[PDB]
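Hi there. Long-time user, first ticket. I'm pasting a complex I've been working with (about 491 residues overall). I'd like to know whether the download I got is complete or cut off, because the file seemed smaller than I expected. Thanks.
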Amino acid sequence: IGISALTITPDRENVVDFTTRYMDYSVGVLLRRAEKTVDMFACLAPFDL
Amino acid sequence: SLQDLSKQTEIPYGTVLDSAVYEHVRMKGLNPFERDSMYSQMWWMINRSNGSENNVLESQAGIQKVKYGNYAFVWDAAVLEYVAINDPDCSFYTIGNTVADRGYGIALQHGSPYRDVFSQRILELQQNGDMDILKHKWWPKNGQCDLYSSVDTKQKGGALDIKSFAGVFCILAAGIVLSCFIAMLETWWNKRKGSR
Amino acid sequence: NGSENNVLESQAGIQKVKYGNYAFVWDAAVLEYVAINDPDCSFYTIGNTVADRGYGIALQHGSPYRDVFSQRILELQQNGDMDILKHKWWPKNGQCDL
Amino acid sequence: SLWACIAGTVLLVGLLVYLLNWLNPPRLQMGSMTSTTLYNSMWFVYGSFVQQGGEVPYTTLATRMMMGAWWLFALIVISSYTANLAAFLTITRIESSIQ
Amino acid sequence: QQGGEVPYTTLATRMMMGAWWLFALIVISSYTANLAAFLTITRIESSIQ
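Hi, the file is complete. Here it is re-exported in full:
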């Protein structure tokens, strides 16, 4: 038996006989959240402190 | 979305060299008979300087280059989510496409006898829904922070409001305070000046 | 003669960047060290995924001890113990968003 | 709500000025149009805020400073109003790209 | 914005003057704001490439 994040691909189905899949494979992207833009002194910020 | 990632070019993105995802993008981008052209753009993000420019060598690198830097990383979504949930700052968030047909499955030797029994039982465990209870063990339903909201903007009409403006009201309140205290201290010292 | 826009030393290049209309090319590790240990964050630096090279110990050819230090370096790397001595000079939460 | 806060501010400021000038009146001519008549005091505290009203005669240091601060508050308010209007006008262009 | 001591004591006059003053101060703000936007539209977004 062999088991991991193993993905069914046709070129491998030529030498090993995968079972029915137990979950779908999905491509994703990682990002960093936008922090926060508002502060109490934004009306004074046009001049340096 | 990945479309909205692929349209812009002001944040660069890439993937680990010779990975399955790398060769899958290379395959998609070169095929002119492809229906969705997006990959043929993304490849020109990934191929830059013959593929030396935006690609990291090892899978730990990209996570840090993202967190400490101006980059994005393309990998297995079910892994990226498992990092994103467990970043202690909840500073990550992650997005991904509804790919299908390809999927995870147990391998077997050629002509092994087990194949039918397992293929039956995996289906029966999916129809029970047990494969969800045995899955919410690992990607839990919700944490302290939402999985995907990049910012809870609340601003939509662009107006100013009391909470954002009141820093100016503090200036007037300070003026009222100081001027009143000046009046009070003058009126008290009028007990002691000897002239008024 | 390869000499006019080139510079006598790495310090000469760094200073010609900070105090002049110039840019300087050097080991990206050193240039990020300069860029973060420059307290102004006045520099920034950029580079490439150069490959097939790395900083290493060299020994007498045929040394009987090469394998011991190679083993201990592989221990220090695969444990991550090297990461402490790297962070000692390149901390990840650096001052400057280069 | 912010329009309401702005509108309500002036009546407080004018009341405070009226009371302070009543309690410490100037050593000047009584009962003139510059004196502590309430409606004139409010009219001054309004007309100064819109820039229009011209100079305000009150001499006593506390209310003098108070009006100097009311002025320096107002000058920010106009700038904020103009700035955010210009922002709204520069923004409002894009949604026809819904496709 | 040339001010002056507008002489009137009556409520109706002062009300009318307040209305006119506020009208003027909104108008000048609108003019300046739209002129700002009109100039800010200056971009090479016009290029066809």
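A couple of notes from our side: The two ends of chain B are 75 Å apart (CA to CA). The beta strands of chain B are 13-14, 72-76, 92-96, 103-104.
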